[PDB]
Amino acid sequence: KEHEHEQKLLAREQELRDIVANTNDKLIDISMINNSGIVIQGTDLQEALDKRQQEETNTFTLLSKEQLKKLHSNILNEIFSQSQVNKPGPLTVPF
Amino acid sequence: MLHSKNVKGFLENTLKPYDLHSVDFKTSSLQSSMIITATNGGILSYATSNEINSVNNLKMMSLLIKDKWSEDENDTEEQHSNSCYPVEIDSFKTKIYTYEMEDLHTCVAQIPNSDLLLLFIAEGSFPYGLLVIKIERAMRELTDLFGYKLG
Amino acid sequence: AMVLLMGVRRCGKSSICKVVFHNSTLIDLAVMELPGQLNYFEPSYDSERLFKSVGALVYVIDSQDEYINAITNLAMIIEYAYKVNPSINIEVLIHKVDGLSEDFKVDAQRDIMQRTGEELLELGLDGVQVSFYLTSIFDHSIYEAFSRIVQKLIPELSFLENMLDNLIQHSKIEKAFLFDVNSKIYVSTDSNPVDIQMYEVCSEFIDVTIDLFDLYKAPELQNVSQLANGVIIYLRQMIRGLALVAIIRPNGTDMESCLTVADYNIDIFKKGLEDIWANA
Amino acid sequence: IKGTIAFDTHGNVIESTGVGSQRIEDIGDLSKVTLDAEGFAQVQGDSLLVHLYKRNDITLAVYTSAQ
Numbered sequence: 001k002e003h004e005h006e007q008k009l010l011a012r013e014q015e016l017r018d019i020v021a022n023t024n025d026k027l028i029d030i031s032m033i034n035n036s037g038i039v040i041q042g043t044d045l046q047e048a049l050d051k052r053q054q055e056e057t058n059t060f061t062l063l064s065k066e067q068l069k070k071l072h073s074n075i076l077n078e079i080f081s082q083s084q085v086n087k088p089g090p091l092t093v094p095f
Numbered sequence: 096m097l098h099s100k101n102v103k104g105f106l107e108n109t110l111k112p113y114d115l116h117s118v119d120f121k122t123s124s125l126q127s128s129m130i131i132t133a134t135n136g137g138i139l140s141y142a143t144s145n146e147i148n149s150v151n152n153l154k155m156m157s158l159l160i161k162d163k164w165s166e167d168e169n170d171t172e173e174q175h176s177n178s179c180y181p182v183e184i185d186s187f188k189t190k191i192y193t194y195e196m197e198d199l200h201t202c203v204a205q206i207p208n209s210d211l212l213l214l215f216i217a218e219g220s221f222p223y224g225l226l227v228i229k230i231e232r233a234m235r236e237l238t239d240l241f242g243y244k245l246g
Numbered sequence: 247a248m249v250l251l252m253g254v255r256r257c258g259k260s261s262i263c264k265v266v267f268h269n270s271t272l273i274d275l276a277v278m279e280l281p282g283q284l285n286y287f288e289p290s291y292d293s294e295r296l297f298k299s300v301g302a303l304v305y306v307i308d309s310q311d312e313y314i315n316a317i318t319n320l321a322m323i324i325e326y327a328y329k330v331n332p333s334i335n336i337e338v339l340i341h342k343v344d345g346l347s348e349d350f351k352v353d354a355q356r357d358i359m360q361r362t363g364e365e366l367l368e369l370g371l372d373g374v375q376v377s378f379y380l381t382s383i384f385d386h387s388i389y390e391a392f393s394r395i396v397q398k399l400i401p402e403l404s405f406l407e408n409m410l411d412n413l414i415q416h417s418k419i420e421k422a423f424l425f426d427v428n429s430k431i432y433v434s435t436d437s438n439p440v441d442i443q444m445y446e447v448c449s450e451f452i453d454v455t456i457d458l459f460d461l462y463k464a465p466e467l468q469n470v471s472q473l474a475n476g477v478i479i480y481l482r483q484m485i486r487g488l489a490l491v492a493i494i495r496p497n498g499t500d501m502e503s504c505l506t507v508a509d510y511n512i513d514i515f516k517k518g519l520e521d522i523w524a525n526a
Numbered sequence: 527i528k529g530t531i532a533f534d535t536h537g538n539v540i541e542s543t544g545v546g547s548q549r550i551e552d553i554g555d556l557s558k559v560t561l562d563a564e565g566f567a568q569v570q571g572d573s574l575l576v577h578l579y580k581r582n583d584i585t586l587a588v589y590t591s592a593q
């Protein structure tokens with residue numbers, strides 16, 4: 001039975017070494033914070049281009065006004081209306 | 096001085112999503128909304144759309160965003176970048192930079208003539224132009240915090 | 247790991263118990279005092295289960311009084327203690343050494359060691375190693391002695407040493423201690439030597455934290471204490487009664503960035519400590 | 527109308543609906559297409575008619591079926 005305990009201790013040594021290695025792998029230093037490179041400038045067009053790059057000529061040929069003029073202005077107004085954030089009070093209080 | 100309750104309510108209000116009715120275009124809410132300093136990048140105030148681990152992760156992300164913004168603020172070469180949207184509101188000039196953080200769209204904008212930063216973070220499906228308009232109209236309403244410096 | 251406290255009357259076992267444990271395996275359990283006077287030991291008076299249930303035997307010797315008979319009684323105790331169970335760690339504390347010089351203390355410890363070794367040689371015991379500690383209530387010595395005694399009864403010592411070494415190497419920590427909430431008995435540390443002054447600083451930090459928390463109650467312990475030179479002292483309660491105390495130096499960096507990276511690293515360390523059942 | 531795409535002079539998406547929600551990569555090509563004084567345009571590509579309108583430096587791309 002003690003040989004089974006020896007195998008259990010060997011499994012304990014492997015598990016505890018794995019536990020040490022697992023918590024050792026998530027250690028982030030300040031050098032990792034300063035030179036991470038994760039925060040990169042990304043645009044919608046560049047994101048679409050990278051998506052097409054990972055997934056994988058002049059297509060457009062040059063040839064109502066009231067409806068488009070109404071809908072563009074209405075879309076802009078609906079975007080600007082919901083962006084109006086009213087404060088619940090003053091931000092800085094005096095003495 | 097400062098008031099934490101009003102700034103918290105303002106950030107909670109800026110966590111509101113968009114629901115367009117003329118065109119059926121539903122947008123999700125922002126992932127996180129917070130205000131950070133321009134010197135150390137620590138979180139002054141914050142608000143989440145939906146505990147300590149997430150706060151620490153948000154502080155780490157704020158530090159990363161401030162670290163990336165610090166070099167961009169002190170660089171004048173390649174100033175005509177397509178990801179920069181410098182707006183001037185009430186004769187106060189600022190620079191807005193958009194960033195991509197893996198699967199999260201993070202946009203930051205310095206509060207003009209002050210040592211504070213305003214940061215909006217959303218998911219990868221969120222459009223960047225809506226974020227720019229959102230943070231511009233948010234900076235339009237923040238006139239009382241203009242000219243505020245750390246003690 | 248129940249430790250047994252043995253000694254003559256008026257040697258200081260009850261006072262040691264009060265001072266340490268009143269101000270399982272690892273927690274500060276209710277230890278057992280045992281007044282052992284000079285007498286003839288009864289052969290196997292149902293004490294085999296008691297000594298088989300003791301993780302480590304601790305003996306207390308008063309340095310003020312004569313101790314040759316105390317060493318003789320200690321040898322008589324060890325004579326059956328090692329026979330019943332050959333895996334018991336035996337510890338001997340030389341108590342009440344506050345009013346002695348360093349040379350006198352070292353000479354007394356050497357004389358006690360030589361007498362115990364000669365008496366064990368006379369009794370024929372071999373393969374037994376007995377540790378000796380110069381302890382006193384009025385200073386840190388009893389805390390360090392109990393720390394060593396507790397550390398001898400944790401089989402996961404080296405893995406905790408490696409974990410704390412990695413935590414210190416990746417957080418600009420000067421010295422991190424894994425305390426317990428009661429008795430101020432630090433459980434694990436790094437490979438760096440245990441500085442007495444820093445240990446006293448961390449112990450009084452533990453006392454200040456617990457007292458200040460107890461002053462405001464009835465509505466996870468965390469504490470950050472920053473000094474004038476930028477040196478911060480951090481606290482975070484671990485699983486069960488364990489608490490982590492670290493001294494982190496800024497090295498000319500941002501305070502809030504250092505706090506954020508230390509918080510994230512220590513939370514990762516706590517998540518790793520959740521997997522190992524070192525608590526309680 | 528099959529979908530709408532809203533983008534400014536930088537070309538970043540403000541809104542993407544319909545087929546244009548999965549047709550984002552054409553903004554870089556459409557940034558070189560000339561307009562009129564009123565901002566309107568009718569440019570055909572991939573068997574679809576795309577209608578443009580630039581007002582306050584934002585070009586709204588609207589998709590309609592050619593057939």
Ligand SMILES: Nc1nc2c(ncn2[C@@H]2O[C@H](COP(=O)(O)OP(=O)(O)O)[C@@H](O)[C@H]2O)c(=O)[nH]1
Pocket residue numbers: 254255256257258259260261262341342343344381382383384
């Ligand atoms: N100066 C000094 N006196 C001690 C120390 N430990 C115990 N004593 C003395 O021992 C007495 C109490 O002994 P006690 O604990 O009741 O003995 P026990 O009941 O046999 O364990 C007190 O009067 C203390 O003065 C010590 O570390 N330093």
